A paper describes a structure:
We purified Arabidopsis thaliana OSCA1.2 expressed in HEK293F cells and determined cryo-EM reconstructions in lipidic nanodiscs and Lauryl Maltose Neopentyl Glycol (LMNG) detergent micelle with cholesteryl hemisuccinate (CHS) at 3.1 and 3.5 Å resolution, respectively. Structures of OSCA1.2 in nanodisc and LMNG were nearly identical (RMSD = 0.81 Å). A comparison of nanodisc-embedded and LMNG-solubilized structures hints at the positional flexibility of the subunits relative to each other while in the closed state. Within the membrane, inter-subunit contacts are nonexistent. Instead, a cleft with minimum width of approximately 8 Å separates one subunit’s TMD from the other. Towards the extracellular side, this putative pore has an opening greater than 12 Å wide, which narrows into a ‘neck’ approximately 15 Å down the conduction pathway.
Previously reported as putative ion channels sensitive to osmolality, a companion paper characterizes OSCA/TMEM63 family members as a novel family of MA ion channels conserved across eukaryotes. The bulk of the protein lies within the membrane; the transmembrane (TM) domain (TMD) of each monomer contains eleven TM helices. Topological similarities with mTMEM16A suggest that OSCA1.2 also has two pores and could conduct ions through a structurally analogous pathway lined by TM3-TM7.
Residue numbers in the entry:
A (entry chain B), B (entry chain A): 3 to 50, 71 to 122, 156 to 401, 420 to 490, 502 to 718
Write the structure that this text describes.
């Protein structure tokens, strides 16, 4: 209804307005400058009208922002821009021809206009990102991953050690390119002990400062809620004792793990003299057995997810299969909160009952990224980049099944107290309009406040911080959040494509979101979010694939929606849409995807040549040998 | 009906019997020994009970036959064996449980038993062939294709020639492995003129010998049927004049093509010092543009299909697309002879009307392999091996659509004068039983006679042969015929899998065919059919894929056939069949296909190492430089 949309918009507009007022005040307080301007502190550049921040955010043209923030950050930001490029002319046309027999054909023709425009834009965007990636990589600084290949599933041998097997194999098969190597160690027990020691120290800092202020009897009952019914009488000496005990265990574990042959995993990081050689090893079959001596480009050391290297290669299939089943149950049992939200989705009081399903769904999905990342870690991936791309994939599917599809179906089930989809989809546009205004418009405006790190920063200063420059530990803005950023905008791309020929009035909400998100994330990318790992936009092929899937879904749903007309006869027309769209995808896959999945030998050779000419005396071996050992071992 | 099957079998059994009597007599006549024992003449080994040939054919165990005949010939023969391994226990079970509620479940369970057995056997066969291939290649003699990579779509340059561009690119990107190269030339005009000259000479040989026997006026009216209404008064001097004219054109063309820069195609055969290097070049991305400087293993020179190298790389997509359309029309318009055959398919006279549809269909399909090969040449492939694999692919599809599916549908259309497929499939088993006995049992028995080369050989001796040792040209048995061999047995694999749980009595006909074909082809492979090119069984992944497709088709058709039972409720069971089957296929694809599609670097290195140790003074450059020039240029 217009009244519910009007009120929901008024609420979300004012909410966003208020968030921007609060933001304007908070960002001018020097005590939280390290929260709002975390980058520039991390980059060594800084030390010590409420919306003016919007036009300032638009300064720093791409080339500068790429060097400042990184390629992934810029490419991610361009997705919001992609959204505006795809849907602005769609929205204009849909309004122009659907908003004041032929209506039937008009819808079919529009499906062709929308698909073609979308494909055209995706093609050009794909080409552009591929070019940005190739230029970025060619101009990128030296890193050990450019010369290093991770070797998995080294076969066992009764006499030779993993190190001996790796060195021998590569000296023989990759002669005069093989430089050095580092064998993977199962240091997980040690790493876990070290993390616990750090947590114990935080308690020591908490209680020592709390005590110093309040010089009385310590009474912590271990958990308080359901802990050990004791007192932790000193609580400081208690944690000192726990630390002393773990410290001894850690020293023992270090001596054992580095002299324990069973800590050696049949894997190693192999380094080559040239990038050309690494490019060859990473792209070629090494032996007869396709599931032995497996090679791939090593993640950069800050991207290597060390825990996953202790998983025997051969059990990875099983872990993956178990997680596929778990994923099914994750989506399966989420129907309960969906049904709840759709039940809720049914004058200033009734319009709130209308409004709230937006929030309720946002809240139920709040911890989904955590679940998806955890299950993604169980499946072994060995890198942060890979883990985030997989979590984003699973989330996208979840949103398709549970946020879009199930909401429409459950909605219809409540409305009803054949092709019922014919009315279920257009009626639910009202729900989606409100939903977008809640996790979209209001969502993004709220995110600029950065309340979580704001609070954490201050609490750490109040209770754990001891001296100067440990403020560096208190300050951590996190990364861009590809895991939630992607899946959210992809839902909107789907909704846009699904409803553009159905309900044109959904699109202005989607467009405002993309515009707002662009300016807010553009702002945050410049000032906060130091990036955890640098992929050279290797996720783009997945972004592309998800939009193509959205096109196919919309094209198919339209067959359903227009499949009620007697003698519709749209079948020989509309079927061409998913066929042509897939053809387009395969074309683009073959033409642009290699930019992202294969490193051409010519680029490797030019890079190696120039690097050598510029730095003729590079001790590459010294540089690479101490990389990829383990964060635990210094 | 039993009477039509009985008579058709009696006809085909006696026909096969007679063919084997005729064969036994013909093979003992010394004047046609070069037809029946063509190999051994080609191998330099020979010079100058009617069924005893069957037990003799079973001598020469695989290892010997592989060296004698070749790997492809042996692997092909094993397909008939694969057939017997898959269907013998299927036939036993189907007879045991279907031939004297639960019938419904019995059929579902059998689908699972058949699929599993088939997949098990295919898995083991796949593994075995992969091992045979790897062993064969490792032990294979030196050939120039082991060191040579074909480079396509060399980009244009205003100043540098294709040769200069290729040499430079490879010296820079593949330094110290690049050995030499040979640029591709558009010698097609010349090659065509040379072939015409040879045809003109054959006429000169025909008329000179005919005249010498009959010393009178020559009266050939150019074609006779619709030629030039003249006499070719001398006919010998006439062809001498045509030869003299083309001879002059050829000399001119040779001088022009080797000094014509426009005859140079942007492609070259690039040779490397090592097999390891060729393996790298052939498996790696060379430049930024994925559709430039494209590399693949060069076909051996006797496999290179030179005509296809004159096609600009960039027009290949268009040629392919045109041929896909042509293929559609080829299958589309074949419905006319299908309908004819099915119309025909409706006491010794009525049983012949029953019998003849077998023959009629065989005859209409007789020239299909020619069509498919011609259209496959239009699409550029550059090798005989590739052309045959593509022709076999298209033929397989044709058989599925036109021989199997359309026959069942057209059959039902005539029978009828909903799920009618429920009865159309089992009723047509009678047709297929007869068809198999005609192009199968009788077909193979007839092929052992080799009537076409028998006749051609004798006619050439009678009219063209002039002296000794030109009998070598008269004798040519052709190759194995993968193009017709594959598609035929695949139809039978399909029919077997489709009808095993439906009509168990189709299977004994299929089994007899596989058994007969095995012994006949085993015999011919040993004695005739010198192989045109040696693939190291690289077609196996396609054989495998076709059987998997047949499993999926049978599994799906069964849903249809059992989908008439009210409350069948077979959907959550039967759907698992194509899902599990595809899963199996992907497993096998990932585990065994690399044996056929990637050459591992370790094997390349071991091969190069051993080769060098055995022959420490190999002038590899001299060896490789004169390869792949063109058959025309000496």
């Amino acid at each position: 209804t217009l009244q519910d949309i009007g009120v929901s918009a008024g609420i979300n507009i004012l909410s966003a307005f208020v968030f921007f007022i609060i933001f304007a005040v908070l960002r001018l307080q020097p005590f939280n400058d390290r929260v709002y301007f975390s980058k520039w502190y991390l980059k060594g550049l800084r030390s010590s009208k409420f919306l003016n921040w919007m036009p300032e955010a638009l300064k720093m043209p791409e080339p500068e922002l790429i060097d400042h923030a990184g390629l992934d950050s810029v490419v991610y930001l361009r997705i919001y821009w992609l959204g505006l490029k795809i849907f602005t002319p769609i929205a204009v046309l849909a309004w122009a021809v659907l908003v004041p027999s032929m209506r039937f054909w008009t819808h079919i023709v529009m499906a062709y206009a929308f698909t073609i425009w979308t494909c055209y834009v995706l093609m050009k965007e794909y080409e552009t990102i591929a070019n940005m990636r190739l230029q970025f990589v060619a101009s990128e600084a030296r890193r050990p991953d450019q010369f290093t290949v991770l070797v998995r599933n080294v076969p066992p041998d009764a006499d030779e050690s993993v190190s001996e097997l790796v060195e021998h194999f590569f000296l023989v098969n990759h002669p005069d390119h093989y430089l050095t190597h580092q064998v993977v160690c199962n240091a997980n027990k040690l790493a876990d002990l070290v993390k616990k020691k750090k947590k114990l120290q935080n308690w020591l800092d908490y209680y020592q400062l709390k005590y110093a202020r309040n010089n009385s009897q310590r009474i912590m009952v271990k958990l308080g809620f359901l802990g050990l019914w004791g007192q932790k009488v000193d609580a400081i000496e208690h944690y000192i004792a726990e630390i002393d005990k773990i410290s001894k265990e850690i020293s023992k574990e270090r001596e054992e793990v580095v002299n324990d042959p069973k800590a050696i995993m049949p894997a190693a990081f192999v380094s080559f003299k040239t990038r050309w050689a690494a490019a060859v090893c990473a792209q070629t079959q090494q032996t007869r057995n396709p599931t032995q001596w497996l090679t791939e480009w090593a993640p950069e050391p800050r991207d290597v997810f060390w825990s996953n290297l202790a998983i025997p290669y051969v059990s990875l299939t099983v872990r993956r299969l178990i997680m596929h089943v778990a994923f099914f149950f994750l989506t399966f049992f989420f129907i309960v909160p969906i049904a709840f939200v759709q039940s809720l989705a049914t004058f200033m009081k009734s319009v709130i009952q209308g409004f709230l399903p937006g929030i309720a769904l946002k809240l139920f999905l709040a911890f989904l990224p955590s679940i998806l990342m955890i299950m993604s870690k169980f499946e072994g991936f060995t890198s942060i980049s890979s883990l985030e791309r997989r979590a984003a994939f699973r989330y996208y599917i979840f949103n398709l099944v549970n946020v879009f599809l199930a909401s429409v179906i459950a909605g219809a089930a409540f409305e009803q107290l054949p092709k019922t989809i014919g009315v279920a989809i257009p009626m639910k546009a009202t729900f989606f309009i409100t939903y977008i205004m809640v996790d979209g418009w209001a969502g993004v405006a709220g995110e600029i406040l950065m309340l979580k790190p704001l609070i954490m920063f201050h609490l750490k200063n109040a209770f754990l911080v001891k001296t100067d420059k440990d403020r560096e530990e208190a300050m951590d803005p996190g990364s861009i959040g590809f895991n939630t950023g992607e899946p959210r905008i992809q839902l909107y791309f789907l909704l846009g494509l699904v409803y553009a020929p159905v309900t044109p009035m959904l699109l202005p909400f989607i467009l405002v979101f993309f515009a707002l998100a662009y300016i807010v994330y553009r702002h945050q990318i410049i000032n906060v979010y130091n990036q955890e790992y640098e992929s050279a936009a290797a996720f783009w092929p997945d972004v592309h694939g998800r939009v193509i899937a959205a096109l196919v879904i919309s094209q198919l749903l339209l067959m359903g929606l227009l499949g009620t007309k007697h003698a519709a006869l749209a079948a020989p027309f509309l079927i061409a849409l998913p066929v042509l769209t897939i053809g387009f995808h395969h074309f683009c896959k073959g033409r642009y995807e290699p930019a992202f999945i294969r490193y051409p030998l010519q680029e490797a050779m030019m890079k190696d040549t120039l690097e050598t000419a510029r730095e003729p005396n590079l001790n590459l071996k010294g540089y690479l040998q101490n990389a990829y050992v383990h964060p635990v071992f210094k």
